[PDB]
Amino acid sequence: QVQLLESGGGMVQPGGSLRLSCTASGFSFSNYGMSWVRQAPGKGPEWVSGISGSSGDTYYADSVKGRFTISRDNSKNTVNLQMNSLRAEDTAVYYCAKEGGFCSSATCYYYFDCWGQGTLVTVSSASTKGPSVFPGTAALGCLVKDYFPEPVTVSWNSGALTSGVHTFPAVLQSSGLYSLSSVVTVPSSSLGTQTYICNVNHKPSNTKVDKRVEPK
Amino acid sequence: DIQMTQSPLSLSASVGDRVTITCRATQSINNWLAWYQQKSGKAPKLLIYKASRLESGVPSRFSGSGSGTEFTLTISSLQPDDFATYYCQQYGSSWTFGQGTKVEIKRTVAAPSVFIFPPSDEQLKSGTASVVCLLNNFYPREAKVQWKVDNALQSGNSQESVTEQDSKDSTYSLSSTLTLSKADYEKHKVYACEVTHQGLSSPVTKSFNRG
């Protein structure tokens, strides 16, 4: 049973530093070489860092060369990535990978056969903000705007009526806050008959705001 | 310093179809090429390594061909579990990924239903106005949303977001948000979003007066 477990991700300000970890088990850590692969939301994956199993040769991506530092402790079966001077473009989801097949030499290039779950690294001047809920056939919904951080949970009538509901992915604005929407379609004749209340919860701020949708 | 370019960027197909994805390298990488499958919310999974070797447990319908600078991935008979994005990766010199190939679920063309939403009184009382135009359950994914303020088409001041294909009916949904200050919103009366789409014979205009 081969598995990789990440740890260390979180939230930092631009210019700050952060440290990742990855505990491996199930195989012979000393033999296989490791690597760190990240993927920014909305783009393709990119290789970031890489280290051999025993020799100690290390490689870094062009966009991160000189800032990051990859290391491993074969005695404790851990590989760690130190991320100094983090920037906005460094915000991504970071994985640790394992070399596929084998290597006859000491350090070499490879494909990744086993991956970790994935840890999240966010870099922003984090103004912590709570979510703002706003209230023949026509569709209604709730608009959550300007919240930090992710995620927000929206439900209609406490999860009872869920058919025809489409919750949209959030977008990031030049100010640093998020915004999304959750819609649902109903016949306009059910304004006063059917009452729709969206239940927007924000676990980081411990703030739930219910805004009843009444006929306007 | 080798750059990997996949072709096609996106392709919509049906179960049973033959699907071929191309992957090109800048410099010659002999046969050090891998392919991965990723589903939304899941880790990537290895499909093929060393250009032509199948990863254990991958179905027999996946195969791979090529050497040098040109490579292909072929799915002999596409299955429901196979709708996903596919990436190639070279490891002949360092490690670089292709840009991704999206396999969209094929379905019949569907016109969006269009709705416009004024900013709410609760929002206005706070100093910002967001006007929303919704395009509901459409196909294909390619769609144009245009914002008109006093019938003046807007550009540069909107952002959009689109969902993946619905797992029940294979449609898409799309959000577009126009953000203006409360002041600028109150200087004008007529707000209109006009939608052109391949499912619509002609542009649909939906419109209100702020009152």
Numbering used by the authors:
A (entry chain A): 1 to 52, 52A, 53 to 82, 82A, 82B, 82C, 83 to 100, 100A, ...
B (entry chain B): 1 to 94, 96 to 212
Cite, word for word, the article reporting this structure.
In addition to VH3-33– Vκ1-5–KCDR3:8, we observed a cluster of highly mutated, affinity-matured VH3-23–Vκ1-5 NANPreactive memory B cell antibodies in our selection.
Sporozoites of the human malaria parasite Plasmodium falciparum (Pf) express a surface protein, circumsporozoite protein (PfCSP), with an immunodominant central NANP (Asn-Ala-Asn-Pro) repeat region (1–3). However, anti-NANP antibody– mediated protection is not readily achieved through vaccination.
